[PDB]
Design a protein around this ligand. Sequence first.
Ligand SMILES: O=C(O)CNC(=O)C(=O)O
Ligand SMILES: [Mg+2]
Ligand code: NI
Ligand SMILES: [Zn+2]
Length: 331
Amino acid sequence: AQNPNCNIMIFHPTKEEFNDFDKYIAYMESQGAHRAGLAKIIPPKEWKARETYDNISEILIATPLQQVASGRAGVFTQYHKKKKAMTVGEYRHLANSKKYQTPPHQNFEDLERKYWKNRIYNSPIYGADISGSLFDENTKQWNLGHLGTIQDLLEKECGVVIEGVNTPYLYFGMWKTTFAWHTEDMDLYSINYLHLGEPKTWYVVPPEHGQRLERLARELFPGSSRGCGAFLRHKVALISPTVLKENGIPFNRITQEAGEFMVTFPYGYHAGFNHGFNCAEAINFATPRWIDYGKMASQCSCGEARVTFSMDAFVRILQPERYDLWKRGQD
Ligand SMILES: O=C(O)CNC(=O)C(=O)O
Ligand SMILES: [Mg+2]
Ligand code: NI
Ligand SMILES: [Zn+2]
């Protein structure tokens, strides 16, 4: 069995190996990368996403989100308070202000310590989930707006043509902006490219151990767990590495830097934080191996998780017994 300890693997594809996206995902899986739940892909030195980032300041962040925490430093929830629209240039200036800027630090490990000590005492503002792309249309390799769609994959594997579309999303971050513990919708893959700026630290639980994280979460968030049998779909709960280690939960960590891709694998729980002003692009995708995870994915039906238009068909075709209840949650 490849990668039996479920370590995060780092790949360095050549320019020739960077041509065929599906083939390279399959290769990484042949080497056991999925067992970790997360992999890093460093593009060949010949590649670039676009020519420059000098002209992005006028992108609008229509609904910046202030991430307000409740709880204790290692075990907390966050809610998202909507703020007035601002441009990427305005948001960058805000991120660099004395109130929001990254503190002085020695190295990534010192910053990670400071994050977990201090996160709850601040409310950073995240420009998340903005439909759009920063890849140049002429970038032919690993262009996250030109991937095979999940609807086409389902049709290729299962024969059923379905409605829906699959487009990327931009994330503008600042120090302490946080992504809560989650798997993807329908336990899909994700791919995330860090276009510019400061790093992003990731934590991940191997897919084979995901239910251990879920059981801990039910213990640590007992009201939320009574409210919903899949409350991590709400994407609000944070648990620190220290708390995970105290509770014996298997996990790994890695820091992504600008110019690097990360891939999350089906049912790989992940969480993390941004080091300072940055911009990432991410999208969900599927492979043949995903189908069985899609069929078994948990679902929130309490009403809180509220998701895209395109998830309807995935539930309807892969999970027909759950469909009616899930859709009640959506309406
Ligand atoms: O970058 C973020 O805030 C969150 N990203 C992801 O969860 C991802 O790419 O799957
Ligand atoms: Mg612009
Ligand atoms: Ni994710
Ligand atoms: Zn729910």
